[PDB]
């Protein structure tokens, strides 16, 4: 259980320490680009003037994945940098970096230091305004920036912060869309506060040259997948409701979601190109709500999960996309007895259940039956409640099936100090990875898993696993233990470098990082033989339709646990889809339909169903009864859809009409 011969020698000469002399304040890390190895470390330290110690704003750069750093503070002329704006990194490998400076009180405007070459050269630029927000890059064009001023003006730059033009004077919120489209809300009188729900949603396509109003009486708006959502307020009422556009505001449509009051919120939990998970807050100070899943138009919503945990005013939620397996999401629900249970869906919210517990795990004191229970997961909520949880769940899309999380085994989330659990099949089965709380990182698309023990005392040991968490080996990475703070590694989980951050034991503490290159641990490159065939979502091996999720199967080529080798940076996850024939279970009920296995017409259109029916587009009122699940790719088999009805006359048949 640990076949890495002489790992100490393979690591000792690959351990690179960097002590950060003259650091006393907060620290921010930013990676600049992929496969560049560039890391920027920013610090800002404010000191009272009656203290002989001066302030400090340092800036360090690395280009070897954190092995060595260079103090490049001279490049920003040793200027105080606004902590709140941090480091505005450009998209992808544009190498764009923008830092905002603190300017003296009374200045005409603010100023920024810009770099378009991965922080090798910086330039000053005095702004015609004082920034209120972090500058935002256009996804389509890194040279395009926008920002809100302290006077709530919207400013746009076409030349990467060089020159700026104000394009609107009373803006509350502004976002980049596709093709350099800007969406922004505006107020008429007073402020964004006073015009709560009385905002106007505008859009510009030509970078401020022209505009179009695309919504009035606006509360707020959001972007998710191909969907533009706006919450609109009622008339002579203080409720609001979701409207949605897929043509960037040219045409809108009222969603089949309940309207909410002032103390309620909507939350776009997750959105892709096929659909959106929408959380609606429950009336009252409940701290829970209901998850709805939409069709591919963001219009018809089916109830997916009740009593979904999500605290007041949209605080903390445990809703997690398990990104290492298609269709898998975990979250927390609130029981009737005010305990919290974790639930997992494998088919994009079509069905939820409890997580299967590890074969060997015994049950908590939370478990009424000592022998039978389930696994529950610590996430954002547990962390907020000051439980001993150092990390939320982790998963990376290039590490197929792998999920790592702090949890507990019983009938509910335990307040006890949690061990760490791992799944390799995307959530179906679990095993205790390590005992006690740890920080964890995935390297080389699953090729290596790294873990640091969470302690209140300084540590000097890192743990690694080359077989996806089954077996572990410990490595002492420094002579003098450090107070651990964090793990840094290149986004994408493809590097073989990991950085251990922390401060020395002290006579004042000094920041220090130890970066380890595992290049000699996995001295062999993976070959075809090192991979096996793996059907995802397999529940019943002999079944002809085993692994069918949303219409199809996917067979992967996974690295063998036993195979100790490097996947490589350019590693491509190999998978083959098999398209399953459609059954009724690939279809969701359209508007005005429900199923008590076939979708049957509703006799009673009540609640928001009735609201939709009375105020919606006849296009959505004419249903087939059935609609195919978004993202579902089944071919052939059954097909229960048509155009049969027109439900407008149905609901209006009760009302007397003029």
């Amino acid at each position: 259980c640990g076949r890495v011969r002489d790992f100490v020698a393979k690591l000792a000469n690959n351990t690179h320490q960097h002590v950060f002399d003259d650091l006393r304040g907060s620290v921010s890390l930013s990676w600049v680009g992929d496969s560049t190895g560039v890391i920027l470390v920013l610090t800002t330290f404010h000191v009272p003037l009656v203290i002989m110690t001066f302030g400090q704003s340092k800036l360090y750069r690395s280009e070897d994945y954190g092995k060595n750093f260079k103090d490049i503070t001279d490049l920003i002329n040793n200027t105080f940098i606004r902590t709140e704006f941090g480091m505005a990194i450009g998209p992808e490998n544009s190498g764009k970096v923008v830092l905002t400076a603190e300017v003296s009180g009374g200045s005409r405007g603010g100023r920024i230091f810009r770099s378009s070459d991965f922080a090798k050269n910086f330039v000053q630029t005095d702004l015609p305004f004082h920034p209120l927000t972090q500058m935002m890059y256009s996804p389509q064009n890194s040279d395009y920036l926008l920002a809100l001023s302290t006077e709530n003006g919207l400013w746009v730059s076409k030349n990467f912060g060089g020159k700026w033009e104000e394009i609107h004077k009373a803006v509350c919120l502004a976002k980049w869309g596709s093709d350099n489209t800007i969406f922004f809300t505006t107020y008429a009188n007073g402020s964004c506060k006073a015009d709560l729900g009385a905002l106007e949603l505008w859009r510009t396509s030509d970078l401020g040259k022209s505009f179009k109003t695309i919504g009035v009486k606006i509360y707020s708006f959001g972007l998710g997948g191909r969907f533009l959502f706006a919450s609109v307020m009622a008339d002579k009422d203080t409720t609001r409701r979701i409207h949605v556009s897929t043509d960037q505001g040219d045409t809108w449509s009222m969603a089949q979601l309940p309207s909410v009051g002032q103390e309620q919120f909507y939350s776009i939990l997750a959105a892709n190109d096929d659909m959106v998970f929408m959380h609606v807050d429950e009336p009252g100070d409940t701290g829970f709500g209901t998850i709805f899943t939409s069709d591919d138009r963001g219009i018809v919503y089916s109830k997916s999960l009740d009593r979904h945990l999500y605290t007041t005013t949209g605080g903390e939620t445990d809703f997690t996309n398990v990104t290492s397996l298609r269709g898998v999401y975990i979250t927390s629900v609130l029981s009737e007895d005010n305990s919290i249970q974790t639930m997992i869906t494998f088919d994009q919210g079509g069905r939820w259940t409890h997580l299967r517990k590890p074969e060997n795990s015994e049950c908590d004191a939370t478990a009424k039956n000592k022998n039978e229970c389930s696994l529950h997961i610590h996430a954002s909520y547990s962390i907020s409640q000051k439980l001993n949880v150092p990390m939320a769940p982790l998963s990376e899309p290039n590490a197929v099936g792998i999920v790592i999380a702090h949890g507990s085994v019983g009938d509910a989330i335990s307040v006890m100090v949690p061990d760490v659990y791992i799944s390799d099949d995307g959530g179906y089965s679990w095993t205790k990875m390590l005992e006690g709380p740890h920080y964890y990182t995935i390297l080389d698309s699953g090729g290596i898993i790294v873990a640091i023990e969470h302690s209140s005392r300084p540590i000097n040991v890192i743990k690694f696993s080359t077989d996806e968490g089954q077996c572990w080996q410990t490595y002492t990475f420094t002579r003098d233990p450090i107070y651990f703070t964090g793990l840094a590694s290149e986004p994408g989980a493809r590097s073989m470098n990991i950085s251990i951050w922390g401060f020395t034991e002290s006579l004042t503490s000094q920041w220090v990082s130890y970066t380890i290159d595992f290049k000699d641990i996995l001295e062999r490159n993976c070959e075809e033989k090192d991979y096996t065939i793996w059907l995802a979502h397999s529940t019943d091996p002999e079944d002809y339709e085993d692994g069918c999720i949303l219409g199809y199967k996917e067979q992967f080529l996974r690295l063998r646990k036993s195979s100790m080798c490097q996947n490589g940076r350019d590693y491509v996850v190999t998978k083959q889809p098999s398209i399953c024939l459609c059954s009724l279970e690939d279809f969701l009920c359209d508007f005005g339909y429900y199923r008590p296995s076939k979708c049957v017409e509703q006799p009673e259109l009540k609640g928001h169903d009735l609201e939709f029916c009375l105020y919606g587009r006849e296009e959505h009122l004419t249903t087939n009864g059935y609609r195919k699940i978004p993202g579902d790719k089944c071919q052939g088999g059954v097909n229960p859809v048509r155009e049969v009805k027109d439900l407008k006359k149905k609901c209006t048949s009760n009302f007397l009409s003029p």
């Binding site: 921010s28 941090g86 990194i89 706006a230 939990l269 964090g486 840094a488 951050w501």
Partner: peptide
């Protein structure tokens, strides 16, 4: 303490 780098409607 270091800082290594849902829509509400």
């Amino acid at each position: 303490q270091l800082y290594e780098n849902p829509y509400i409607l």
